[PDB]
Design a protein that fits this description.
The structure is cut from a larger assembly and holds chains A, B, C, D and E. Chain A is mostly beta strands. Chain A is built from two helices and seven strands. A four-stranded mixed beta sheet of chain C has the order 2-3-1-4, with helices on one face. The chains are: A mainly beta, B alpha+beta, C alpha/beta, D alpha+beta, E alpha/beta. Chain D binds three RNA strands through strand 2, strand 3, strand 4, strand 5 and helix 2. Chain C: GO terms for molecular function: GTP binding; GTPase activity; RNA binding.
RNA sequence: AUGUGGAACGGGGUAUUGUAAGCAGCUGCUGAGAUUAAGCCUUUGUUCCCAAGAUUUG
RNA sequence: UGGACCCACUAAUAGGGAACGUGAGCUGGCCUACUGAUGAAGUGUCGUCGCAAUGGUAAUUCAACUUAGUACGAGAGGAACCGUUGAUUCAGAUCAUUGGUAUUUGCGGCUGCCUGACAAGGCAAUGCCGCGGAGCUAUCAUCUGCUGGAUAACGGCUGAACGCCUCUAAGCCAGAAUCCGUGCCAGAAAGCGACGAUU
RNA sequence: GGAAGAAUGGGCCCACUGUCCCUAUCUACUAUCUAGCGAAACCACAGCCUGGGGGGCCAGGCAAAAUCAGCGGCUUGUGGCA
């Protein structure tokens, strides 16, 4: 499972894809497993599965409401050890509902929270920081 | 383990400060908010008077080992002796710097 | 989905309509408000009937769309022509109900008084009830069809299979029961296995579906299944004639059934002893026959330790169980002193990481440093 | 809106927390106390190993915010008797001690110095004259009464507070027969009861106090009682080795550098509480043993602190003690 | 070859690391996996239950051999001290501070020959060669930088991605001086390293691995006998 | 309403800014200077203040 | 529930009423309530410590690991009780850690004017900029959110009516997020008690 | 985060922003008190709620002064005809 962690990627936001599948920019549509809260747009963060559309990339891949896992976040969130973490940008991965990415590599460091939650993401990761 | 600040070059205790990682797999720890903003603005520590880097370079200043009871006991006393000896040299150095 | 009775379905539909839609309309309101209230109740009644009919149609499959083996078995064991007729009658009834509801809604759109609406509301319900009551035998046939379909197995002709057919009680079922974990009951009465029994089996890292067939409606079903199936024939002939059928009769039956056995591997099993002799009484040769039928159907050296050449869960469960058992890392340590292993260590003292600045050589270095410090002081 | 139960949102009528619910008595159990009242000074954060079975964070390192509450030992000054009646608990009589601490006398007087200090004067003499009368009253307590509470007061002198009035309150004495409680109360007259008597460095306590005031419905200054809130450590500041975590050694004192914000320097017995507590700093708080009996793993697990932070809470402090500070900083002109 | 799953996932390689002389297991998870490892090779080789950097991805992040074991520099010093206490004295553990944090996923090492990602630093390669006492070659597996995760290495055989060319597979096998088989495990999963772990005498695969894949792995690793 | 009393100041500790003015010869003074409780901690520091006025009370 | 009959989450996105729902909350084609704040008064007097009549109430739900790839199922698949950890909504607090906050007009930097000059200062309706403690606040930060009885459906037991039988008639047992208490808050300003002094 | 309700604005796109998520903080004034000055509308009599015939009637519930501040007022699930 995953503990409470700061949400900072609400719907109607543009978020960058960091794999080799050819996708470049990702548009958030909806968030999996969100409660029925009143007047609160669901958000996303590292290790969270959300519904997103590929804005730019390969034409066949885009125009599909597909699950996406965020791997990088600008917002500063606290890790349970007590240290606050923030990244230079927001990065995500192109993944099927089963939990498998079409791409075969990732770019740059990878949050361990995303890596530990999804074991095959750690398999594709080469730099876990 | 208390890490060393990237900008302030001081002791960083757990909890306080922030951790910043880079695309080149380089992670920088900022001791305080001012230090984090100092690294945010790319202020040179050698160009910052209140930084140990300038204080040093301006004339102003992996294999684990099996534990042993005797080694641990002597390590603590040696550290206290090392600090006492090191502090005296700085006082002489400051006196020489003042003179 | 389960098939309810005609009376029960009407009551459930009527009860659901009353429970969901409001039932308190005072006569002092507007005519449109009364018209809207009556129309909503009618529309809800139409929707509930439409949902039930659509669910029945979706649950009911298409005989043509089914596989050739499944469709033939369905037609033989369920009278697919009669089933198709009943489904069309239900579909026609659903269309007729929708037309009646649309006519009633249009009539309700020009409603005048509460009594006119009340009479119209009753009239629509009565017409629907009569249509539902008329379509009574269709529900009974559907319920019987659902029970037969549920009891029916999932045929997989694409995968490797072994069809056992021949004289009844010729030991083919016993061989099938031995080969596969599926156990079909056998009785002294002939044609005990009314329906085919399929048992999955593993051989040479391959999955084989041992499917039994009725001895020779059951015979017709067995013939139809063997007609369209990628499987090998397992014609078992009673060598000792203990199955009640003569050897010549079994041979004649096998020759007659050879048109269905064509384009497949044929095995001649000499029961109660490819021609394979299998002693049904002695239960000998069953494995050999199955194997034959399956075959017919088809510088970095390793430092292996001496211990390798020659539990934790139980321990945790006994003490406190999972989630209540804490495993101590001190025990799983190679420290020389057991007291040292079970004791803590100094992590960081006086602002310095002592654990990161303590080395085994410091034991002698400290004494040397102490001597050096004294010499420097002197 | 908020909870309907907490209505009305009126300011508390009591400055200090009142324990309305007390643990059920058990004569089989030995005589023991149930409630404590200390002073909230401030808070810090500590580093602690998280030995939670079955959790994903099992046998590893976690950071938890803690609160520091100074609890100087009280002085038992009297006992009261309570009788179970068809109208509830009724106060039968009350017996006190001889030499009341001078802070207690401040409680009875709104203008102590102007008053002639006449409180309990005739009671003191009548005790020294004839202890038989007191013995008769204690006979009444031990014979007729069913619930016994001892009169205890905070001893504020050794605290670093401008206030000089002792906070008086009652603590149930649960355990043993009625005569056993009275005898325990009698033998504890005029003496001090330490915090270590009731809490054992790992126990299930309920912190009570009046929340802080945000000003104007009313917003702030209501009575509150928090549940759970496990204890992390019951320090003994009288020992110079009070904080002194075994893992880190690093000789230190609980008092943060420069003193607690708006409180001062903590010197006496203090209790460490996880999370937060109702009420702002330098306010009297009340603790009590948890009413219910729950053996949940979050309430039964042992705690062995790894490292506590004694940095400068005033501003963005970064130094634990001057001993570790001086050698890091270059030798200044002073 | 033994088929088992960690928690509810068969990706044993991510959650555990198996060497020719020691075994790495996670902490705080399902105790059945530790019992299975202990029953399989616990009495033969040590099995350490610890987390590197407070994570259960130690198998997919740490790389090592029977001679030496390498861990990311981000691992806690307290974790390192516990590892040395658990591990035998002849086992060498060295911290690696390189641009690649996932040592296991980037480089797969055998008892004699090791293949690392081309982006590995020269100092890290020298440290790896010094620690593991094996030859380190900087190359790519199936055109993927993550050679240590998309391919599996063992003394008696090697497993590569099914998309690898025959000539490339032959070249890699000749370079590794061991037989190589290109395929997929865990019912078609292309992460052979993440989905399979094989030692010199024992092999541990996912519980969901296909029987044909298990039979192929046993023949390739010669683990049948 | 005479006290480990109160107060105003000041010292120390703690903190923010960034190394002053000036003396000078970027460097030294100087990781200085300034501010530091007005809702920070402490006071063997100097000073004065007070064993006070009115009102209602069986 | 979030977005223009729809398309996704979620456990679901139930139906209504307040007869011109709430158009004197909303838009388009004096006095009396309620909330809070004081308050004179019996009880001699003032004060401390309690009692608690009564009134209100608060937590909901998900997934996650064992218990499992066991029961079961030819297989394909695949339980549950318990135990334990997380998450969502809501509630009650708290400002160590992080962020926000600038009338500390605190420190630093920038521009202009003046004294014949340097210095020296001052000002620019808070000139401009950086940092900025303490405070305030953050589902942007953290902590915590029970346990006993009586019940409905329902399962039964004994047992007549009715020489059998019968959960019922006389009785009893079990059993629902239900009901009533426990805890939580208010504390009668015309409910009360113990206790200290009493010109 | 960036239209989910300041930028310089530029060429549906891009940029921008508390429109919104979700409000938080500050300053000033008003508000507030004190001193002084000081109205008018309006006024049968007044003023606690449930039910029955509204605030005055009947039967109930209750009921403690003086005040300050924010602020309300029959119908349902079953067609008809022969």
């Amino acid at each position: 499972t995953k503990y409470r962690m700061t949400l900072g990627l609400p719907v109607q936001a543009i978020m960058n894809c960091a794999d080799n599948s050819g996708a470049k920019n990702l548009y958030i549509v909806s968030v999996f497993g969100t409660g029925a809260r009143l007047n609160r747009l669901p958000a996303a963060s590292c290790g969270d599965m959300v519904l997103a559309t590929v804005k730019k990339g390969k034409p066949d891949l885009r125009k599909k409401i597909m699950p996406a896992i965020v791997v990088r976040q600008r917002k500063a969130w606290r890790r349970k050890d007590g240290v606050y973490l923030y990244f230079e940008d927001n990065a995500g991965v192109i993944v099927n509902p089963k939990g498998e990415m079409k791409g075969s590599a990732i770019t740059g460091p990878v949050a361990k929270e995303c890596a530990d939650l999804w074991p095959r993401i750690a398999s594709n990761a080469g730099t876990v920081v | 383990r208390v890490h060393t600040c990237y900008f302030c070059s001081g002791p960083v205790y757990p909890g306080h400060g922030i951790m910043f990682v880079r695309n080149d797999s380089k992670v920088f720890r900022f001791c305080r908010s001012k230090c984090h903003k100092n690294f945010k603005m790319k202020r040179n520590p050698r160009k910052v008077a209140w930084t140990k880097a300038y204080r040093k370079a301006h004339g102003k200043e992996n294999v684990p080992v099996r534990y042993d009871r005797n080694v641990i006991a002597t390590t603590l006393n040696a550290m206290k002796r090392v600090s006492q000896v090191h502090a005296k040299r700085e006082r002489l150095f400051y006196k020489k710097r003042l003179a | 989905t389960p098939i309810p009775d005609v009376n029960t379905f009407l009551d459930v539909v009527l009860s659901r309509t009353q429970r969901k839609t409001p039932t308190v309309i005072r006569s002092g309101f507007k005519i449109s408000r009364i018209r809207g209230f009556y129309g909503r109740k009618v529309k809800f009644t139409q929707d509930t009937i439409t949902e039930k009919l659509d669910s029945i149609l979706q649950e009911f499959p298409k005989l043509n769309d089914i596989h050739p083996f499944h469709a033939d078995l369905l037609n033989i064991l369920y009278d697919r022509d009669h089933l198709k007729i009943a489904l069309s009658q239900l579909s026609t009834a659903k269309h007729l109900v929708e037309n009646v509801a649309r006519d009633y809604i249009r009539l309700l759109k020009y409603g005048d008084s509460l009594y006119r609406c009340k009479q119209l509301k009753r009239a629509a319900l009565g017409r629907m009830a009569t249509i539902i009551k008329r379509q009574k035998s269709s529900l009974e046939f559907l319920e019987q069809v659902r029970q037969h379909l549920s009891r029916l197995p999932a045929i997989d002709p694409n995968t490797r299979t072994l069809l056992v057919c021949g004289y009844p009680n010729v030991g083919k079922s016993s061989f099938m029961n031995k080969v596969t974990r599926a156990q079909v009951d056998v009785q002294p009465y002939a044609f005990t296995t009314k329906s085919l029994f399929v048992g999955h089996f593993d051989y040479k890292y391959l999955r084989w579906q041992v499917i039994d067939t009725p001895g020779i409606t059951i015979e017709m079903q067995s013939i139809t299944a063997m007609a369209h199936l990628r499987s090998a024939v397992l014609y078992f002939m009673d060598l000792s004639e203990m199955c009640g059928y003569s050897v010549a009769a079994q041979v004649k039956l096998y020759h007659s059934i050879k048109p269905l056995f064509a384009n497949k591997v044929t095995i001649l099993v000499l029961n109660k002893i490819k021609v394979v002799q299998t002693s049904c009484v002695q239960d000998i040769g069953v494995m050999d026959v199955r194997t034959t039928a399956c075959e017919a159907l088809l510088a970095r050296p390793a430092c292996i330790p001496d211990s390798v050449k020659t539990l934790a869960r139980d321990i945790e469960a006994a003490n406190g169980g999972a989630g209540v058992y804490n495993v101590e890392l001190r025990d799983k340590y190679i420290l020389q002193d057991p007291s040292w292993k079970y004791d803590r260590m100094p992590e960081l003292l006086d602002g310095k990481n002592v654990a990161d600045f303590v080395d085994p050589e410091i034991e002698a270095k400290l004494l040397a440093l102490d001597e050096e410090e004294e010499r420097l002081e002197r | 809106h908020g909870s309907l139960g907490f209505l009305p949102r009126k300011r508390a009528s009591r400055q200090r927390g009142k324990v309305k619910a007390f643990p059920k008595d058990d004569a089989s159990k030995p005589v023991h106390l149930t409630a404590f009242l200390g002073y909230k000074a401030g808070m810090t954060h500590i580093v602690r190993d998280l030995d939670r079975p079955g959790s994903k964070m099992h046998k590893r390192e976690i950071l938890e915010a803690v609160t520091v509450i100074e609890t100087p030992p009280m002085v038992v000054v009297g006992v009261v008797g309570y009788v179970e009646t068809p109208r509830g608990l009724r106060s039968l009589t009350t017996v006190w001690a001889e030499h009341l601490s001078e802070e207690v006398k401040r409680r009875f007087y709104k203008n102590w110095f102007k008053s002639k200090k006449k409180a309990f004067t005739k009671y003191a003499k009548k005790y020294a004259e004839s202890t038989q009368s007191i013995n008769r009253e204690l006979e009444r307590i031990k014979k007729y009464c069913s619930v016994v509470r001892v009169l205890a007061h905070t001893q504020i002198r050794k605290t670093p507070l401008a206030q000089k009035k002792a906070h008086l309150m009652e603590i149930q004495v649960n355990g043993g027969s009625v005569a056993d409680k009275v005898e325990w109360a009698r033998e504890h007259f005029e003496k001090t009861v330490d915090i270590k008597s009731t809490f054992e460095q790992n126990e299930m306590i309920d912190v009570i106090g009046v929340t802080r005031g945000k000003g104007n419905g009313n917003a702030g200054y209501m009575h509150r009682t928090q549940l759970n809130s496990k204890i992390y450590r019951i320090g003994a500041g009288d020992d110079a080795k009070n904080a002194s975590t075994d893992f880190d050694a690093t000789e230190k004192r609980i008092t943060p550098m420069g003193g607690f914000v708006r409180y001062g320097v903590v010197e006496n017995d203090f209790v460490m509480l996880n999370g937060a507590t109702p009420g702002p700093v330098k306010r009297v708080l009340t603790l009590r043993k948890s009413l219910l009996t729950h053996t949940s793993r979050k309430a039964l697990e042992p705690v062995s602190l790894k490292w506590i932070d004694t940095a400068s809470k005033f501003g963005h402090g970064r130094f634990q003690t001057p001993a570790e500070a001086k050698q890091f900083l270059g030798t200044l002109k002073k | 070859a033994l088929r088992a799953q960690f928690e509810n996932s068969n990706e044993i390689g991510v959650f555990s690391n198996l060497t020719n002389s020691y075994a790495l297991v996670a902490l705080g998870g399902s105790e059945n996996f530790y019992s299975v490892f202990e029953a399989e090779l616990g009495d033969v080789v040590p099995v350490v239950h610890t987390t590197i950097g407070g994570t259960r991805i130690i198998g997919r992040l740490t790389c090592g051999n029977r001679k030496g074991l390498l861990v990311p520099s981000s691992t806690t010093d307290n974790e390192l001290q516990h590892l040395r206490n658990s591990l035998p004295d002849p086992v060498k553990i060295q911290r690696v501070d390189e641009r690649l944090s996932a040592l296991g996923n980037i480089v797969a090492c055998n008892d004699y020959v090791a293949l690392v990602h081309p982006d590995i630093e020269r100092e890290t390669e020298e440290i790896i060669a010094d620690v593991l006492d094996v030859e380190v070659f900087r190359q790519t597996v199936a055109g993927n930088v993550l050679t240590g995760s998309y391919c599996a290495l063992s003394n008696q055989g090697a497993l590569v991605h099914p998309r690898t060319s025959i000539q490339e597979q032959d070249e890699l096998s000749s370079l590794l001086q061991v037989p190589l088989v290109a395929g997929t495990i865990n019912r078609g999963s292309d992460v052979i390293g993440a989905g399979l772990v094989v030692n010199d005498w024992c092999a541990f695969a996912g519980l969901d691995t296909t029987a044909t894949e298990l039979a192929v792995c046993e023949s390739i690793f010669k683990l049948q006998d």
